[PDB]
Every structure is written in structure tokens, then in C-alpha cells.
């Protein structure tokens, strides 16, 4: 299962990190093409998106760690 697979979980984190990176890049270009409250709304939507993608990334990494932790906490000895 996916959530019992530290390696798959850490791979997917990768993919989500790449999406964050892509969307950060497209935001900077897009903000540039935009040359003040409409600007705020866009800036905000962009950040919201990048944060969600950071969450999944941090969540998957945390979970991959914690699963490895559950395993070693019940073998040591």
C-alpha cells in the first residue's frame, strides 16, 4: 500500500515539489506580464496554491519518516 511505502511516499513528495516549483515559476512570469487589488487576488491565489502543494509535500515526507520510526521502535532490542 502507498502509505506503507516510504519510498513511494517520498517519490510522490518529489512530484509535488516539482509542481510547487512549476507554479512558483509561472506565477513570477505571470505577475511580470501583469506589469492593484486584482493583483492582490492573484498573488493570494498563487500563494494558496503553493502552500497546499507544500503541505502535501511536507505531509508525505513526515509520514515516510514516521512509518520508518514505527518500524524501528519495534525492532530495537
Amino acid at each position: 500500500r502507498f502509505m506503507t511505502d516510504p519510498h513511494a511516499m517520498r517519490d510522490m513528495a518529489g512530484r509535488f515539489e516539482v509542481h510547487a516549483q512549476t507554479v512558483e515559476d509561472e506565477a513570477r512570469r505571470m505577475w511580470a506580464s501583469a506589469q492593484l487589488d486584482t493583483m492582490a487576488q492573484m498573488n493570494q491565489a498563487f500563494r494558496n496554491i503553493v502552500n497546499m502543494l507544500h503541505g502535501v509535500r511536507d505531509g508525505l515526507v513526515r509520514d515516510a519518516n514516521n512509518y520508518e520510526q514505527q518500524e524501528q521502535a519495534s525492532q530495537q532490542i
Binding site: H19, V23, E26, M30, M42, N48
Partner: protein, 58 residues
């Protein structure tokens, strides 16, 4: 032509959106299933933000 750029960058952003939904579906178990209300809310909130950007670009 500065309008063309913005529209294009938007199409580009919309492709990203779609690529992310395909990955959220592939990582559906993270939210306790791809069909879980946790997953669908994530998606719904994702669309709300892309919609904002899309709108103001068009």
C-alpha cells in the same frame, strides 16, 4: 501581444492544474482515499484558486 502572453501563460497554468489533479488522484491514499471528502475538498480548493487566476487573466 502582451495580452497574448497572459492568455498563454494562463493555458500553461491550467495544464499545471490538471497535472496536479492527476497526481492528487495518484496519491489519493494520502487523504484516506481518492474519493474521500478530504481529497475532494483539497481538489475543490485547488480549483477555486486556479479559477481566480484564470478569470483575471481572461
Amino acid at each position: 501581444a502582451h495580452g497574448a502572453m497572459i492568455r498563454a501563460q494562463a493555458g500553461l497554468l491550467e495544464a499545471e492544474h490538471q497535472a496536479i489533479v492527476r497526481d492528487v488522484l495518484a496519491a489519493g491514499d494520502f487523504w484516506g482515499g481518492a474519493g474521500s471528502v478530504a481529497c475532494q475538498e483539497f481538489i475543490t480548493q485547488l480549483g477555486r484558486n486556479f479559477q481566480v487566476i484564470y478569470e483575471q487573466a481572461n
